[PDB]
């Protein structure tokens, strides 16, 4: 039994991909695959209009 490898990195690296909400748009307006299994044709075509 060996201890694990402790890999140390800069704390700034973990925030590289992070973008503040005031700096990014809502990508849920292009979310087509998220509607599958949750949204029905009735809701989109007959009810909501």
């Amino acid at each position: 039994i060996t201890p694990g490898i402790c890999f140390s990195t800069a704390s700034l690296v973990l925030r590289a991909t992070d973008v503040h909400p005031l700096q990014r748009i809502d990508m849920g307006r292009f979310d087509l695959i998220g509607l599958e299994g949750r949204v029905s044709r009735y809701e989109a075509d007959t009810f909501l209009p």
């Binding site: 307006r29 087509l32 949204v39 044709r41």
Partner: protein, 48 residues
Amino acid sequence: SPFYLDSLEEKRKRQRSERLERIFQLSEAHGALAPVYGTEVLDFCTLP
């Protein structure tokens, strides 16, 4: 109404208008997209 303030109530009604507009815009945005297939189509096409 001795302690009534006109500016505070104007601010509050402006805030209420903004809140209602936000509610409307979000409700329109959250139901704008239609599924490519939809639950009914998938259920019909999904064999046991």
